[PDB]
A paper describes a structure:
Although TiLV-NP is considerably smaller than its influenza counterpart and unrelated in sequence, it maintains the same topology and domain organisation. This comprises a head and body domain between which is a positively charged groove, where single-stranded RNA binds.
These higher-order oligomers resemble the pseudo-C4 structure but incorporate additional NPs, resulting in circular assemblies with diameters of ∼107 Å for the pentamer and ∼122 Å for the hexamer. The NP–NP interface areas are smaller, averaging 1240 Å² for the pentamer and 1065 Å² for the hexamer. The pseudo-C2 and pseudo-C5 oligomers appeared the most stable with uniform density according to local resolution, while the pseudo-C4 and pseudo-C6 structures displayed poorer density for 2 and 3 NPs, respectively. Only discontinuous RNA density is observed at the NP–NP interfaces suggesting two potential binding modes: either individual vRNA loops interact separately with each NP, or a single vRNA loop may bridge two adjacent NPs, leaving a flexible RNA loop at the NP-NP interface. Assuming TiLV-RNPs adopts an anti-parallel superhelix like influenza, it is tempting to suggest that the circularised TiLV-NP pentamers and hexamers may correspond to the loop found at one extremity of the RNP or could, perhaps, correspond to a nascent RNP formed within the replication complex once the RNA product begins to bulge out.
Author numbering:
A (entry chain A), B (entry chain B), E (entry chain D): 34 to 350
C (entry chain E): 34 to 349
D (entry chain C): 34 to 312, 316 to 350
The structure:
Amino acid sequence: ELPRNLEVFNEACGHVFGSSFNREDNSVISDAAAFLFKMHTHSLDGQEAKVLRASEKKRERENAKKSRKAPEAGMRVGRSLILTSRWTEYCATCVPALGSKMKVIKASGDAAMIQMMKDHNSLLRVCVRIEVWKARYVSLVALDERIQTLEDAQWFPYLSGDSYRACPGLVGGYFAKKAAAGERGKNYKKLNQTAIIPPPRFLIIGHRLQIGDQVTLRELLASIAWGLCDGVLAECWSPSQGDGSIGVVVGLPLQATGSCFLVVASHGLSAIADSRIEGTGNTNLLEECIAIQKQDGVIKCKRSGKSLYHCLKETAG
Amino acid sequence: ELPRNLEVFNEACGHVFGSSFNREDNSVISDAAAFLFKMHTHSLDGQEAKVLRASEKKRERENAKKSRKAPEAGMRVGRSLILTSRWTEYCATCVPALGSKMKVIKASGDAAMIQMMKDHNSLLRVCVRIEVWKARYVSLVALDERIQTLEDAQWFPYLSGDSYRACPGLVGGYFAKKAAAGERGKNYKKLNQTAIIPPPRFLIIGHRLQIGDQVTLRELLASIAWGLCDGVLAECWSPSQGDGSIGVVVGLPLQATGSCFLVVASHGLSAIADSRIEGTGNTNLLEECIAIQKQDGVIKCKRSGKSLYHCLKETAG
Amino acid sequence: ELPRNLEVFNEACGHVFGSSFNREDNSVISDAAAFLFKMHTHSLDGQEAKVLRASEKKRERENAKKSRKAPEAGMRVGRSLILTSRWTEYCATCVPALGSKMKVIKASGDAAMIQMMKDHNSLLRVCVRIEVWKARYVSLVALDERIQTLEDAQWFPYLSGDSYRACPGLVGGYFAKKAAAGERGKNYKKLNQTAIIPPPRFLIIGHRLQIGDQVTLRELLASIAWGLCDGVLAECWSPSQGDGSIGVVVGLPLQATGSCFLVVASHGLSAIADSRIEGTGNTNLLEECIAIQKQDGVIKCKRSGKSLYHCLKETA
Amino acid sequence: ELPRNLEVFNEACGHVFGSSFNREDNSVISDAAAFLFKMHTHSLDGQEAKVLRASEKKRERENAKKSRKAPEAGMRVGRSLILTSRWTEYCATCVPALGSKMKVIKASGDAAMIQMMKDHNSLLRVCVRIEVWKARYVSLVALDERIQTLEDAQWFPYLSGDSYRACPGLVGGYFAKKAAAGERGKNYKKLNQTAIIPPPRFLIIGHRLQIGDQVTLRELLASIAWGLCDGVLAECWSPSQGDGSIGVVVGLPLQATGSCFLVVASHGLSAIADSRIEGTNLLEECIAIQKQDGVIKCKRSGKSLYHCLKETAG
Amino acid sequence: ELPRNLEVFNEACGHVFGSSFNREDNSVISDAAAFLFKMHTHSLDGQEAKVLRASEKKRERENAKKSRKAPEAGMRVGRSLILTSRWTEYCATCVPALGSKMKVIKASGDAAMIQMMKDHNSLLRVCVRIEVWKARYVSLVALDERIQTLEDAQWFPYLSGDSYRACPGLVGGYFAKKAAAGERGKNYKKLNQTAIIPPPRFLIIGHRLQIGDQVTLRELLASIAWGLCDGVLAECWSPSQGDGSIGVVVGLPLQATGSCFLVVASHGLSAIADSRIEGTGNTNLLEECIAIQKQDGVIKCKRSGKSLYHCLKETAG
DNA sequence: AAAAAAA
DNA sequence: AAAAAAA
DNA sequence: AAAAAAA
DNA sequence: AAAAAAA
DNA sequence: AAAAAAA
């Protein structure tokens, strides 16, 4: 009924949070995913210290974390997430020991341990996807101070190293910048800043985002873009009968990933660094378009020239 | 009559300097505040050596400071500040011992000790505010050799770690740069380079700067801006009858909130550095205006396009 | 009937894949050539470890490869390639031993060994040519994430060291970059990025690509150019009667290896990047033309100003 | 009569060169200052090798220097400088021992040693000021092969580490580049590439350069600028009656040091990287020359001082 | 009659080639100089192997060179050069042993060895000057494939390491690139791409190139410029009576070396990255002139805006 | 917009 | 433009 | 355009 | 456009 | 758009 990743995530969240884990609230799912990600990276209190090559300051911080008592049952997480009494058992059972690697487990040959490690990897990937989607959802109506120029915005989201490792194609930030600056191997994944990510309530259920879905404007925009994206993407939504809060999806943007506008010299031609700019691109900027695929077909929509955050702020005035 | 902070500062300065501390001279007040900050930071000769995690060079420097004789009574400070014979008693009484922390004092429960620690913290904050104002006043006519570009000027004033700790929102420099670069938590405070600070002769009295105050051009500018702020802010001053040296404040600037107008490249659209300017192509910056709020109302004044330091230098030729 | 190289490749592919090796599918031929190149480079499981100067990590990887079981008969390769039970015999026989060099064999003087070494070199050259063509065919619709600027795009295709060594005149990548950075000896060869390469279904048969051949648009473009070449090259193709999928070639590009028109700064003058453009100063890059040779004659076609990849994406 | 620094320099030059040291020749004074600087930094032959943390190559070079015989009396220095037989005594006495530090001397408490160290420091400062002046004078007519772009020209003069330490505000080069690139403390000084330096024949006498003094065009330009400075500065010089070789100073440049044209963004304004650019023909600019009558703005010539000096001689 | 350098080169060439060495042919002199350079760098077959720090591949190559038989007397060199039976004696006697350094020879105190090393250095310098001149002469009628852009053309000629070491102010290539990129000591010498090099038939004789000399167009151009220099330089040549092939030099270019067009910011002025480009009015490049000094006087000749190679190619068609 | 590596 | 944390 | 630190 | 260093 | 060397 469900793939391995989604089933593992559902089981883990249900076990850790019991019945307090609502299965239809984006905020609840994002908070639960963040907590599970912290648990599975040994970021919670009372777990193994990360000291393999840590600096003395990092060693002190990890020692303080280890000394600190672990979270207790009944503790409130986020807004409406309450820990059960069994969460310690789950953390002890399903969490790989610090430093564990897939090669070591494979050498061991224990099928149960291999399955547990696969479940842990899938859970990390799912939680990082949910974390990226929540970062986009927050950034629609809350500017990040660190993002002041195009260069600063070029690496959104800014997530920890574990997030980058779990999903290098979606997660940006310092680690993505480091990977791009350094040597690029055959495994290099470029940052698909505007990759389509289903809403968490859809991601856990496995329902792929598509036309006809009943989704709020903010969550749809967080799914297909973020705050500093061109406002024209708002055209991918249409309020339902009686306005309300939930509308419908009318289409999806095209060219979401893989946009390269280079032309190399050949056969006596001249190299071009940008197809769009060549000629007089400054006057053609606001004349650009985006291809939106709808149920009927593809349509080109003129760019609004205004940030998504600014459009949402203005329409909310 | 006066808040706790100003009263504590007045008592401390009176005790240390007696009658030699003028209550109407900005330079004297700034020198006294700097000396008091040094005393409460254990930066004077003969005070506790900082060795908790000091490097061998730092350990040697602190040992040299400790071995050196402490300042004697009657020692000249700055220009017109003379230490009183009772300054040693005040230093011994009102200066918490090195390493003092509010948590430990609260655990002790001594009401007198808690009040003393609160007074010390208030004195630190007041002294740091006076230090920042004096840095602005100095930079109006005497640039800093460490400021060469906009990136360097983004961290003015350049003050020590203690000043940044006391007033993180007003004090820039190396520590502000470090804080901005690293992780930003809920307690992170952005550097307000041009935060309003009344002159020290007003700050100790608590008289908030407002329209109609009889202040000098340079001191007003240091109150609202610094050397590299655009010269248009000079419109906030007006010479009084007969010119002279003291005029009157006609208005104050308004700090605009944070609002980024970027539009990153997405789905084939070209990046926009600024939505407002890209469309019509009005790239000229000299047209920009500042909102000066006056007694009559708010007025948009066109920028001069020249640094405040340059304007002051040219008008003083 | 066929040259030595194509005959060697045909015999090798027939022996290794038997009847499962289709002779008219470009994807199948490309996969077979890739597998043969892997086999003759001792990169498969169970072959000699490359340790002559390997680093400890490289030594570990090669030891892991050697310890691993060799591919078994009937194993599925690519999509429609199945290994025959006699592939092990060919691998043992026709594959030169690791570290073998032509000088050593010539000193030995065994005519059969010399012929085997020559056949192996020809097989490497043919396999690498097919690999380069397949790289071009892939790049027409799926950009390489390692290409983001013109500097990086200058070194396409990005192939391994073996590919560069076998065919230095077609293969780019890190090794070609290193060769360019270092000394340029008399044996140095520049990367002819857009060198015409017949499709594998043509290369193995020896049928040189020319006008009138019934070839698909994508395969023709992969033959004469790659993803980031200008879209104007699409003019070399023309749909046949009834459209369908297979058309015909109407012309081929004329490789413009013209002499440099630079004038370096000297005696206080100013450097000129191009003496021709200096006069009129027509700074419009959309006016350039490419000389396509057709059956009737050569014609100058105006550049489209858009990447071949973008034109293909829009037309699809 | 004279400050400590100039008196110390005059005494040292008299002791080391006797009467052969001409007090009115810029080249001779510069060469004598360079020799004294080499002596007081322990660079001449026969002085202690520098090995504290030297690399094997540096250790070998300094061992070679130590083994090599010390300079002999009567040796020709520069062009018209001859060593005296007593120079060895001065080198042994007034030169601090290698590694001497003012803190150590102060801890010792010997007044004579403290005075000697102060004299050594003043001599180093004076010698490096003269060295920078001479570097400017040379660069007027003989370009440096190391200066090819404005980025390279930004660090003139290129002088040894001892020169940078003696006067970090004037000297440039690799050490100034390192100081600028790295962390800058409260002691940081920016490279004042056109700070006014009196000519050596004036510097040792202590006569501050001012309008009316009889100086040569080349030496005045060296005092106020160098080769790659905009040629308009030549307006500061006026030939005397009958041309000849010596003229007079009419005016001096202003804003020599401390020119910043930034405007940081504030109160919603936009940051301006350059006030001049936001106003843009470069050749229209002017430089403020202060004369006896008053300040006058002279239009920039747009041509490097070296080019103008070369063309005026052809 | 002749300086030490030219006398040494003449003696060495006569000893190694005897009467087969023509004293008026540029190709023959260039070939002889190249062969002597190969001999004096221990690059010929059967000479000392360079193994001090050579890589294993380099060690193999040098071992192969050492094992190979040395050149035999009577071998044909170039076109019209034949080795003499006494060349082995000269190679053994006048060639310093591999690794010989001037410091070691001076320490030994042997006057004869010091003189031999001086002769070796002078011969290296002369051979490298001739090699650079021949490189220019080749580039006039044969483009170098390695030169495709202005940056590539900036380092011509591309000569080996020994050539760069002997004459660093005339020889470019990888080693000049390395010297420019790395630290620049006081001894640093820039690459004078258009220095005046007398033709080999004049360089060995010591006759400095001057006005009125009977030199062919191609060899004059190779003397004063190279393939990708401005075509205007052809004005420095004039066919003699009856045309023929040999003409006469009517003038020489000025500003051959040491051309800097920088003005630095000082006293509030603005930095000029290039005086020519910044010149008042948009100076069209084809309007630029070169100063040719002639017997009568200097004349400004307008640039032809076309390469010397292309001018020669068109004039020969 | 599958899996295997992996401050 | 209040307090509590805290090179 | 004073003193104290100090490849 | 002299001499000494010295992939 | 023939062969020989050969991270």
